Amino acid sequence: MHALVQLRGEVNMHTDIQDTLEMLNIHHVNHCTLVPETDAYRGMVAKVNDFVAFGEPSQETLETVLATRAEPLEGDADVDDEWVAEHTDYDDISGLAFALLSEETTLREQGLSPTLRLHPPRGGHDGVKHPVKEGGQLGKHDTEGIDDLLEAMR
Partner RNA sequence: CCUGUCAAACUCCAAACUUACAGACGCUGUUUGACGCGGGGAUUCCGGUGCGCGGGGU
Partner RNA sequence: AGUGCAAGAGCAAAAGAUGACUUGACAGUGUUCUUCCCAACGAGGAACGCUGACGCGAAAGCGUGGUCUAGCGAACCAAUU
Partner RNA sequence: UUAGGCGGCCACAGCGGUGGGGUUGCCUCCCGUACCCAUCCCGAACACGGAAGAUAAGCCCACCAGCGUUCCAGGGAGUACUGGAGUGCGCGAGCCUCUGGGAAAUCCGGUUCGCCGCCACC
Q: Which stretches of the chain bind Mg ion, using CB under 5 A?
A: 127
State which residue, 131 or 154, has the beta carbon closest to RNA.
131
From the list Mg ion, RNA, none, which binds 14 (C-beta under 5 to 8 Å, kind-based)? RNA
Using DSSP bridges, classify how beta strands 2-6 and 31-35 pair: parallel, antiparallel or unpaired: antiparallel
Least separation, in Å, of the C-beta of 65 and RNA?
Answer: 19
Asked whether position 27 contacts RNA by CB under 7 A, the answer is no
Q: Which of residues 41-100 bind RNA (CB under 7 A)?
A: 41, 46, 49-50
State which residue, 46 or 77, has the beta carbon closest to RNA.
46
State which residue, 71 or 92, has the beta carbon closest to RNA.
71
Q: Decide: residue 49, CB within 10 A, 0-12 exposed, 13-18 middle, 19+ buried.
A: middle
Query: Which one-letter amino acid corresponds to residue 134?
Result: E
Q: Cβ of 141: how many Cβ atoms within 10 Å? A: 23
Query: What is the C-alpha separation between 37 and 102, in angstroms, rounded?
Result: 10
Scored b (16 or more CB within 10 A) or e, 90-113 reads beebbebbebbbeeeebbeebebb
Query: What is the C-alpha separation between 72 and 12, in angstroms, rounded?
Result: 32
Q: Segment near RNA (CB under 7 A), from 55-63, 65-73, 88-96, 126-134?
A: 126-134
State which residue, 12 or 102, has the beta carbon closest to RNA.
12
The site for RNA (CB under 7 A) is made up of 12, 14, 17, 22-25, 38, 40-41, 46, 49-50, 108, 114, 129-131, 133-134, 138-140
